Structure formats: C-alpha cells, structure tokens
Swiss-Prot record:
Modification Phosphothreonine occurs at: T269
Family: Belongs to the protein kinase superfamily. CMGC Ser/Thr protein kinase family. MNB/DYRK subfamily.
Disease: Intellectual developmental disorder, autosomal dominant 7: A disease characterized by primary microcephaly, severe intellectual disability without speech, anxious autistic behavior, and dysmorphic features, including bitemporal narrowing, deep-set eyes, large simple ears, and a pointed nasal tip. Intellectual disability is characterized by significantly below average general intellectual functioning associated with impairments in adaptive behavior and manifested during the developmental period.
Annotated residues for binding of ATP: I32, G33, K34, G35, S36, F37, G38, Q39, V40, K55, F105, E106, M107, L108
Domain Protein kinase: start-end pairs: 26-343
Modified-residue entries (Phosphoserine), positions: S177
Positions annotated as active site in the UniProt record: D154
Protein known as: Dual specificity tyrosine-phosphorylation-regulated kinase 1A
Signal peptide region: none
Taxonomy, superkingdom: Eukaryota
Function: Dual-specificity kinase which possesses both serine/threonine and tyrosine kinase activities. Plays an important role in double-strand breaks (DSBs) repair following DNA damage. Mechanistically, phosphorylates RNF169 and increases its ability to block accumulation of TP53BP1 at the DSB sites thereby promoting homologous recombination repair (HRR).
Effect seen on changing Y188F: Mildly reduces kinase activity. Does not abolish autophosphorylation on tyrosine residues
UniProt subcellular location: Nucleus; Nucleus speckle
Amino acid sequence: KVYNDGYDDDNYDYIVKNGEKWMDRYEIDSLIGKGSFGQVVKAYDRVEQEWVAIKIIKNKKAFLNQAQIEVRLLELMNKHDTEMKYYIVHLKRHFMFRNHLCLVFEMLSYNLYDLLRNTNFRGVSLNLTRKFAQQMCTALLFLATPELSIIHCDLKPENILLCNPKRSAIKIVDFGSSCQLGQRIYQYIQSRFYRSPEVLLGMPYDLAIDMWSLGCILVEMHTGEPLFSGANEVDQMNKIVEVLGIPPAHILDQAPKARKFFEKLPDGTWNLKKTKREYKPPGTRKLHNILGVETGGPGGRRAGESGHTVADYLKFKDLILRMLDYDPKTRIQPYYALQHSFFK
Ligand SMILES: FC(F)(F)Oc1cccc(-c2cnc3ccc(-c4ccncc4)nn23)c1
Ligand SMILES: [Cl-]
C-alpha cells in the first residue's frame, strides 16, 4: 500500500507510536526528536535490559545511503575504540524494520544547543568550555588515527550530546555526512555557520575542517551565539573576514571559488567584493573583544566570577586562533591542541 502501508508520513518518516514493540525486543517509549535523516526514538531493549536510542532513518534511498555510510564508519571506529574511552557515540547494532534502517545507540542526554538554550544563550562557563574542548580534541585525535582518517564534516552544537544533564561528559553523534580521507570532495558541506574557508573557497579539504568547526563551536559555547552566522556563503565569508582579516594571497590564488567573494586590484592585491549590508573592515572585529578578555567575559557576564581570569581568556583566545588558522596546513592539530596551555 501507499505511504509504506500507512506506516510512513509525508516526509518518509516512520509514524512513531508509543508502546510499540519492535522485533519482539525493543519497547518504544516515545519520540526524542527529528532531524534531516529521520527520527531518534527512546526505547527499552528487553534482551540487554537497557534503555537505547534508536535512530529511524527515512524510508528513502538518499537517506538510507547516508545511514549505510554512517554504519560503516561507526563499525570501523568500534574496531579501534572497544574501551569507548574516545568520545564518540557507540553504535550497538542495526536492523531493518518496516522498510526503515534502524541504528541502535547508547542513550544519551540532550545536545549542546539545548544546553545553550537552558542558559538563555548566556553561555556556559569557561571551565565547562575547557572540559568540552578537551573531550572534542581527544575525539578529533581518535578520528585522525591513520587507519581511520575520518572527517566528521558536520560538527556543530546540535551534533554534540551530553551523556547526562548533571555531568560534563560529551560525545559526538551523527556520521551520515562523514567520510574518510581520499573519497569524494564536495561543495557546500558542513553547516554554514561552521563551514571552513577551504570548503567555502571550493578547495580540497581534510580533517582540519573539523578543527575549524571546533573553534567556532567553543566560542559559541561561552558567548552563547554563533561566531560566524552567515545567511549565505558570501555573508558567511564576509563575517569570517570581519574577525580574521582577508585570507592569505597564496590561498586565494589557488581557490576555485575565490572570485565569488574577492577581487584582485590592478596591483595584484586581494580585496573583498562589494555586493545593502556593509561589513566591519577586515580583521577589525577582534576576537579579544568578542570574548571580552579584559572586560569580564562576553557581555561582561563573567565580571567578578572565579575561573575566568584574564590569563584564562588569553590562553583560550590563543587556542581558538590556532583552531581558526586560515591555512589548513598549519591549523593546530588534535595532538598539539591537547598540549596547549589552556589545558595545563
Ligand atoms: F534530534 C534527534 F536527533 F532527532 O533527536 C535527538 C535529540 C536529542 C538527543 C538525541 C539522543 C539521545 N541519545 C542519543 C544517542 C544517539 C543519537 C544520535 C545518533 C546518531 N545520529 C543522530 C543522533 N541521538 N541521541 C536525539
Ligand atoms: Cl584578537
């Protein structure tokens, strides 16, 4: 019958019903949320006797194909992360159910965007930020293992989950957009706020694009707001240039999409194309002041508060700037990010 025998909605999602029992094994409790891939559902595994989160993929070839890549990437991670000490959500198994691929995960709590909303977008503390930063650098270290070389390609606050509302532990979720070094190279990957300059410029990219995203995420987690909130690629590039200046000439010379944001003057120098919206001149929106290094943190909301010293902010800003290096050949890599003084 049409609509998968009446089991699916107009968006190829399985219509979730509380209390349903799948495979005479999973007792579905309730829907947790939806994403572009489909839905995540809270369930009780009768066999293992534990709560699980089941990701129900949309009943559509394009989404099924992405989930098949995710399964392959998580299974290859499990072969190297059997202790699970590396901070990636753990896939327990998968199965097909009513023409939906279902991935069974350990149950986690809500995501880092939800954590910001509980904060009313005032940000979490610098100490909590440091703890988040340390775990994500360790995760990026694990993904950089040569036999893995996995690029997540969609790091953002909604793709990082707390294990538990009362603890600082986090895990990275959702590898449906992910890939390994040496596969297809795409335009328009990564969520726009977190999209690296390499990808905007249509250049080849590697694991460093996740570090760029990480840098943007960490500032957001403390300020409460995206660092670079582009409405489109040109706005996105221009907002990056406000904080970090014009990209180096050697990179723009190599960039296939450079002329979409920049032009060369007769003397050979690269300048922003003018499109209305007017931007701060390049490099004048100093991150020193977005973080309010000498002025009580973002918006002054940390004035008079311990664990927020000027030296802490100077170390934080230094680490962030290394993560937002324009050149992916020198952008700080996970191993050395973990030796930065912000963590000592
Ligand atoms: F927003 C939606 F994701 F739809 O629903 C949500 C929203 C807030 C949390 C979760 C949640 C709780 N415990 C887990 C474990 C894994 C996963 C996951 C794995 C792979 N890909 C995506 C998610 N999610 N999850 C799912
Ligand atoms: Cl600065």
